[PDB]
């Protein structure tokens, strides 16, 4: 169980990292879509 | 020196004295310690040094000298 | 393992009695036929000593 927990910790960290990147991407997309809503209202 | 630990513990675990053990011999058959006795010896060595030895490495102590080789 | 475990104690008791018996004698037994032939030698010694 000790070695299993070490391995599981490593994998868990990897998944957390890729989700952090997607969170940043989501904020960027929100910026772009705010601009998009403004454009719709302008048209 | 620090080896006095091993060369002491071995005897205390096998009934032989400090000088009885010979580096050329093997615990499994040349000291009379069977499977259970050798498990007890390796596990007592583990206890004394407050460390850990997995099964694979632990199985490589059949000879007298090995008890110090992994230690020092 | 269950079969062997059930069988073991009987075999061990039998072996202790056998070792005691043959050690009590000068000759060491190894088989049923061997025990029988030892019976016969014992009878011959009876009928000479008598």
């Amino acid at each position: 169980s000790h070695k299993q927990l070490a391995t599981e910790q490593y994998r868990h960290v990897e998944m957390a990292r890729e989700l952090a990147e997607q969170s940043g991407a989501s904020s960027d997309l929100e910026t772009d879509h705010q601009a998009a809503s403004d454009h719709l209202n302008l048209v | 020196t620090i080896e006095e630990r091993v060369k002491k513990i071995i005897g205390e675990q096998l009934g032989v004295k400090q000088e009885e053990v010979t580096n050329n011999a093997s615990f499994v058959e040349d000291l009379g310690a069977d499977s259970l006795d050798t498990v007890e010896l390796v596990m007592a060595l583990e206890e004394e040094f407050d460390t850990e030895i997995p099964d694979e490495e632990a199985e490589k102590i059949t000879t007298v000298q090995a008890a110090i080789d992994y230690i020092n | 393992i269950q079969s062997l475990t059930a069988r073991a104690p009987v075999w061990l008791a039998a072996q202790d009695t056998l070792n005691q018996l043959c050690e009590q004698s000068g000759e060491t037994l190894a088989s049923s036929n061997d025990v029988t032939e030892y019976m016969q030698q014992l009878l011959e010694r009876e009928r000479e000593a008598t």
């Binding site: 169980s1 000790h2 927990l5 599981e8 910790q9 868990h12 | 205390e12 675990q13 009934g15 007890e40 596990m43 007592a44 583990e46 206890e47 | 104690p9 061990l12 008791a13 202790d16 070792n19 005691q20």
Partner: protein, 50 residues
């Protein structure tokens, strides 16, 4: 959850530590008894392997 299992590992480790002291201390006495018993008792009289 996995951090709490790690703390389980620590608790189990100290349990193992306790068991280990038990084992080594027991052997220390086994040594002495089997030293003294070699006055022919262990041969078959005390060692009732049945």
């Amino acid at each position: 959850e996995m951090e709490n299992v790690q703390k389980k590992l620590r608790k189990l480790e100290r349990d193992y530590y306790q068991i280990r002291e038990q084992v080594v201390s027991a052997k220390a006495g086994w040594c002495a008894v089997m030293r003294m018993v070699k006055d022919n008792g262990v041969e078959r009289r005390l060692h009732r392997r049945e």
